[PDB]
Amino acid sequence: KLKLSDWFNPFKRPEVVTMTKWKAPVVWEGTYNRAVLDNYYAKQKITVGLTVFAVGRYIEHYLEEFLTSANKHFMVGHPVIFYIMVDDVSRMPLIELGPLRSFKVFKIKPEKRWQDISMMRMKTIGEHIVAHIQHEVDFLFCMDVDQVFQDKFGVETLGESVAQLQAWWYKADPNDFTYERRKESAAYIPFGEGDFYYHAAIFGGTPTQVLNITQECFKGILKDKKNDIEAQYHDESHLNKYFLLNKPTKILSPEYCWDYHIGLPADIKLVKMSWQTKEYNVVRNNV
Numbered sequence: 001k002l003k004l005s006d007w008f009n010p011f012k013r014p015e016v017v018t019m020t021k022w023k024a025p026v027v028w029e030g031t032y033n034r035a036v037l038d039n040y041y042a043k044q045k046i047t048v049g050l051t052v053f054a055v056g057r058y059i060e061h062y063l064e065e066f067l068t069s070a071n072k073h074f075m076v077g078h079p080v081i082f083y084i085m086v087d088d089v090s091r092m093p094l095i096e097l098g099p100l101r102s103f104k105v106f107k108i109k110p111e112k113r114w115q116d117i118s119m120m121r122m123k124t125i126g127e128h129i130v131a132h133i134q135h136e137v138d139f140l141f142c143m144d145v146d147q148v149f150q151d152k153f154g155v156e157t158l159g160e161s162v163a164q165l166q167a168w169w170y171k172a173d174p175n176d177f178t179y180e181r182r183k184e185s186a187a188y189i190p191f192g193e194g195d196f197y198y199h200a201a202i203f204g205g206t207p208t209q210v211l212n213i214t215q216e217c218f219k220g221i222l223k224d225k226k227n228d229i230e231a232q233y234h235d236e237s238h239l240n241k242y243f244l245l246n247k248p249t250k251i252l253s254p255e256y257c258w259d260y261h262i263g264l265p266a267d268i269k270l271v272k273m274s275w276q277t278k279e280y281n282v283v284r285n286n287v
C-alpha cells in the first residue's frame with residue numbers, strides 16, 4: 001500500500017526527467033526517501049536477490065570486485081542472496097560476506113561466443129527463477145559483472161519491473177538511440193518509436209516480472225537465430241524491445257549505472273555503480 005509520493009519527490013530534481021508519460025518514477029539522487037522505504041520493506045521482511053554471471057576471464061577480472069562492492073552497498077539493511085553463475089567454480093573468489101548477505105554458486109556451461117554468453121543469461125535466469133529464486137526473494141536484480149557498486153544501491157530501486165537508463169543516451173532523442181533497426185530482428189524498434197535507451201547491465205523486478213522479461217528476451221534471441229540475424233546489441237536490443245512493449249514500472253537514473261569515461265556532469269550527483277573499463281582483448285576470445 002506504498003504510495004509513490006510517500007517516498008518519491010520529483011521536485012528535488014527539477015532539471016532531469018523524473019516521471020515517464022506512463023507515470024513511472026525515474027529515480028534520481030535526491031528524489032527518494034530511503035528511510036521511509038527501508039522501514040516499509042523491513043516490516044514486510046523482504047529478501048532481495050542479485051544474479052551475476054562471470055564466464056571465462058570475467059571471473060578473475062571482475063567478480064571479486066563486483067561481489068565485494070555488492071556486499072557493501074546493495075540493499076544494506078535487508079537480507080540479500082547473491083546468485084553467482086560461473087563456468088568454473090574452482091575460480092570463484094570466496095569473499096567474506098557481511099550481515100544479511102549470503103550466496104550460492106552455480107556452474108553453467110560456457111557458450112562458445114561471448115555474444116551467446118551474454119544472451120544466454122536470459123535463458124538461465126528464467127530457469128533459476130522457476131527452480132528457486134521465485135521462492136527465495138521478493139525482488140531480483142540481474143546485473144553485469146563488469147561494474148562496481150560505489151554507494152548505497154537500496155530499496156529505492158525496487159519495483160515490479162525496473163529498467164536502467166543507459167549512461168550515454170539518457171538525454172538523447174529516441175532516433176539517436178542504438179536500438180536494433182533491422183525489421184528482420186525480433187528486437188526491431190522503428191525510428192519514431194521508443195521511450196528510453198535502457199542498459200542491459202542492470203534490470204530487475206519481482207521474480208514473476210523478471211521471468212517474463214527474460215523469457216520474452218530469450219524468445220526473441222532464439223527467433224533471430226532461426227532467421228539468421230543477431231541483434232546489434234544482443235540481449236540489450238531485446239531488452240529495449242521488451243521494455244518498449246512492457247513499460248518498466250520504475251527506471252533508475254544513470255547515477256545507478258555510470259560510465260566515468262563520460263566524466264561527471266552536473267546531473268550525476270551521487271554515483272551508486274560505475275562501469276569497469278572494457279578489457280575485451282583479455283576477457284573475450286572471439287570477435
Ligand SMILES: O=c1ccn([C@@H]2O[C@H](COP(=O)(O)OP(=O)(O)O)[C@@H](O)[C@H]2O)c(=O)[nH]1
Pocket residue numbers: 052053054055056058114115117118143144145146201278283284
Ligand atoms: O565472455 C563473457 C561475456 C559476457 N559475460 C557476462 O555477460 C555480461 C555482459 O557482457 P559485457 O559486460 O562484456 O558487455 P558490455 O557491457 O561490455 O557491452 C558480462 O558483464 C558478464 O556478466 C561473461 O561472463 N563472459
Ligand SMILES: OC[C@H]1O[C@@H](O[C@H]2[C@H](O)[C@@H](O)[C@H](O)O[C@@H]2CO)[C@H](O)[C@@H](O)[C@H]1O
Pocket residue numbers: 166168178199200233236261
Ligand atoms: O549500444 C549500447 C552499448 O553501448 C556501449 O557504450 C558506448 C556508447 O554507446 C557510445 O556512445 C560511446 O561512444 O562509447 C561507449 C563505450 O565506450 C556500452 O559499452 C555497451 O555495453 C552497451 O551499453
Ligand SMILES: [Mn+2]
Pocket residue numbers: 144145146201
Ligand atoms: Mn557490461
